Design a protein around this ligand. Structure first.
Ligand code: PB9
Ligand code: FPP
Ligand code: ZN
Lengths: 315, 401
């Protein structure tokens, strides 16, 4: 018999007959309170009673229903969440019904740590991830960048080996918003954990795909960071053609991201005994000042550091 | 003012004629920031960058005593409210009446768990986040009474109960794991001198696994790089003296890229929105990196400025993040709160004060009364409070159990 905390006929716990036997316990804030919250009476009421059942450790069905109200008043109260999990096991509650509850609470407050952790615990207890990818997909359809949602998704995928369709899901979301950095991250998460990037065919695929996205949206930093991220391992100077192919977009797709990437390629060329060290250095230094003075001034101190750093190293 | 210069309109977003939720939301923010920047021009007044000290003060000093039910959502984070408020006052150079200090000490005493660590409020179970805030608050107060509140033996016991075999730490018993917990632990453990030979075994390595392809650090291995987690990661490594464990150069490039060419403030992750609180989490990374690179004897480091646009950041904070009625906030249009007041101010201080070895150099935009007290980049409490607290607890021996 759940009397919704929002129901028009909701009554304070101090006016409920089935709670008449217990005395609520007021919160001890001390004689000279600090950062004292002037709680609403509904809040005070629920927590004064939660505290009563907590202190005596009353593991009853009524305490259980009560934690639901305390959670709704403040979903971030982890002490309450802890007691609710204690009650779920003592009372032997149907965990699937609790899954329905957590599903609903997350839908309402998707940016709360506690609700996601609770869900994970339920999935672990049940050892059933059959509902996860779909549920998470629904949350991401509302906020494609919800950090907890993505973290839960990676946990589920890695814990139950559910890799098979994630790359396809990634492609879907990239089409929707090629600028979603969370998705580019998911892409690297799936690939590095399945095939890896050592597979030349795979790397080829990835670089080509990224270059195409860059052409479509030249100023999308995520695509650029992914291109740099997957090539930086072995070293940019390891791919001779890349420089030339980027040097061609110089007029067409010439954003400050391309300039910066060029300097990155030069940096690595110098570090790996490249040809024309005297020449490559001057180009690099040239771009560093163009970036510092014109194209990317918000980052002048960084580019000055780089040029000045490039000099001391390869003068 | 850098943000008001003609060539600055040139930094507006270029969507390449391909709109997505991301470009649409960025454009909305820029449009609103531009309105703020131009407000002077359209009203015909000389730009006056003034930190509304008095306003912020009344807001803070009142919140330190009581809060409206709008804060019911933070009823499990009261030690944080203490820290955010006391630290903002500290930065504003406002004193803490001995009577208030004692009241804070007493309240935190009620929040402390008999098993070690502090809970989000009287009687709540201990948690590493409020534990970190309680200790930082007590150190800001810095009196013998404050220091004595902390049960060092139980705190060590508590940290051990959260320590995992892989090097990570749970945020609390039966709770979750992420980089923030490593920072919270390393912060309180170092300040109170309870670090044992094996307490942080494997922690530096676990944190390093959180650095990804972007250069930044995610909450757990595999996750997207985020300013909050990156600060916690690097700061924890600096405390453990294991910063070398990270690729500092990819990290440096990642964080500097997080500053918005147009707004001047920092975003939390690639392709999302600017937010005043990152003025600390993100910008605070530059001092830490400067120190680390300097330790490796890097010769190209600047001797007057951090590696981010100090002026642009101060401009974003001063023009866009202050609530006329006092207090600071995320971005124009958002409501004020003690969290943003604390970090917008922390970031401003960092942006104002540079220091490396014998070199000191300040950059104070607006009226000189805008200068704030310095803040320690690792703990985010006054540098003096760090030395005083550490010097104090070093008098005591590491708990032996
Ligand atoms: C026991 O747990 C605790 O005590 N904890 C301390 C607080 C913590 C949550 N955090 C929250 C703190 C916080 C406090 C106030 C006030 N007054 C207002 C907003 C806010 N947000 C919201 C916000 C800030 N910037 C943008 N947004 C939306 C996040 S956080 O700092 O980790 C974080 C999260 C997301 C984005 C940015 N920062 C959770 C753990
Ligand atoms: C010691 C301690 C507790 C430090 C806190 C570090 C910190 C700020 C972590 C933030 C983690 C997080 C979930 C951000 C995403 O929120 P969001 O997606 O709403 O924000 P965003 O869009 O700017 O990423
Ligand atoms: Zn914020």
């Amino acid at each position: 018999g759940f009397l919704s905390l929002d129901s028009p006929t909701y009554v304070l716990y101090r006016d409920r007959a089935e709670w008449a036997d217990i005395d609520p316990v007021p919160q001890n804030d001390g004689p000279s309170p600090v950062v004292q919250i002037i709680y609403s009476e509904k809040f005070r009421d629920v927590y004064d009673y939660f505290r009563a059942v907590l202190q005596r450790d009353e593991r009853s069905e009524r305490a259980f229903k009560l934690t639901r109200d305390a959670i709704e008043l403040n979903a971030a109260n982890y002490t309450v969440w802890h007691f609710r999990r204690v009650l779920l096991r003592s009372l032997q509650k149907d965990l699937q019904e609790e899954m329905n509850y957590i599903t609903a609470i997350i839908e309402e407050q998707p940016k709360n740590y506690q609700v996601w952790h609770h869900r994970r615990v339920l999935v672990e207890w049940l050892k059933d991830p059959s509902q996860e990818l779909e549920f998470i997909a629904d949350i991401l359809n509302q906020d494609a960048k919800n950090y907890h949602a993505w973290q839960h998704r990676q946990w589920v995928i890695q814990e139950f080996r559910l890799w098979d369709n994630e790359l396809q899901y990634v492609d879907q979301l990239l089409k929707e918003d090629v600028r979603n950095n969370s998705v580019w991250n998911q892409r690297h998460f799936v690939i590095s954990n399945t095939t890896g990037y050592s597979d030349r065919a795979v790397l080829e695929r990835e670089v080509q795909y990224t270059l195409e996205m860059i052409k479509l949206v030249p100023h999308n930093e995520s695509a650029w960071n992914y291109l740099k991220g997957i090539l930086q391992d072995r070293g940019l100077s390891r791919y001779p053609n890349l420089l030339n192919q980027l040097l061609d977009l110089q007029p067409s797709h010439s954003s400050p991201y391309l300039i910066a990437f060029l300097v990155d390629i030069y940096e690595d060329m110098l570090e790996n005994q490249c040809d024309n060290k005297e020449d490559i250095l001057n180009k690099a230094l040239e771009l560093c000042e163009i970036l510092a003075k014109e194209k990317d001034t918000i980052r002048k101190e960084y580019w000055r550091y780089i040029g000045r750093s490039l000099q001391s190293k390869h003068s | 003012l850098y943000s008001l210069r003609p060539e600055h309109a040139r930094e507006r977003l270029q969507d390449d004629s391909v709109e997505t939720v991301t470009s649409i939301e960025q454009a909305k923010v820029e449009e609103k920031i531009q309105e703020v920047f131009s407000s002077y021009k359209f009203n015909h007044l000389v730009p006056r960058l003034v930190l509304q000290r008095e306003k912020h003060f009344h807001y803070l000093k009142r919140g330190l005593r009581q809060l409206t039910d709008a804060y019911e959502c933070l009823d499990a984070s009261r030690p944080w409210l203490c820290y955010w408020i006391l630290h903002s006052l500290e930065l504003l150079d406002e004193p803490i009446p001995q009577i208030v200090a004692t009241d804070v000490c007493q309240f935190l005493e009620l929040c402390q768990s008999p098993d070690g660590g502090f809970g989000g409020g009287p009687g709540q179970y201990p948690h590493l986040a409020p534990t970190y805030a309680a200790v930082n608050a007590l150190c800001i107060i810095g009196t013998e009474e404050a220091y004595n509140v902390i049960n060092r033996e139980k705190l060590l016991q508590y940290l051990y109960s959260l320590k995992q075999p892989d090097g990570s730490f749970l945020m609390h018993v039966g709770g979750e794991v992420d980089v923030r917990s490593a920072y919270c632990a390393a912060s309180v453990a170092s300040l109170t001198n309870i670090i044992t030979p094996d307490l942080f075994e494997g922690t530096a390595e676990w944190i390093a696994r959180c650095q990804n392809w972007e250069g930044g650090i995610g909450g757990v291995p595999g996750m997207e790089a985020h300013g909050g987690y990156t600060f916690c990661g690097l700061a924890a490594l600096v405390i453990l003296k294991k910063e070398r464990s990270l690729n500092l150069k990819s990290l440096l490039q990642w964080v500097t890229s997080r500053q918005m060419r147009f707004e001047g403030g920092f975003q939390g992750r690639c392709n999302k929105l600017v937010d005043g609180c990152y003025s600390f989490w993100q910008a605070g990374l530059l001092p830490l990196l400067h120190r680390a690179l300097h330790a490796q004897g890097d010769p190209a480091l600047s001797m007057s400025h951090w590696m981010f646009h100090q002026q642009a950041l101060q401009e974003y904070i001063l023009m866009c993040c202050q609530c006329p009625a006092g207090g600071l906030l995320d971005k124009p249009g958002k409501s004020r709160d003690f969290y943003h007041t604390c970090y917008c101010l922390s970031g401003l201080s960092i942006a104002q004060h540079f220091g490396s070895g014998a070199m000191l150099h300040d950059v104070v935009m607006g009226v000189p009364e805008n200068v704030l007290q310095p803040t320690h980049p690792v703990y985010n409490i006054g540098p003096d409070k760090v030395i005083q607290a550490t010097t104090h607890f070093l008098q005591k021996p590491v708990p032996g159990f």
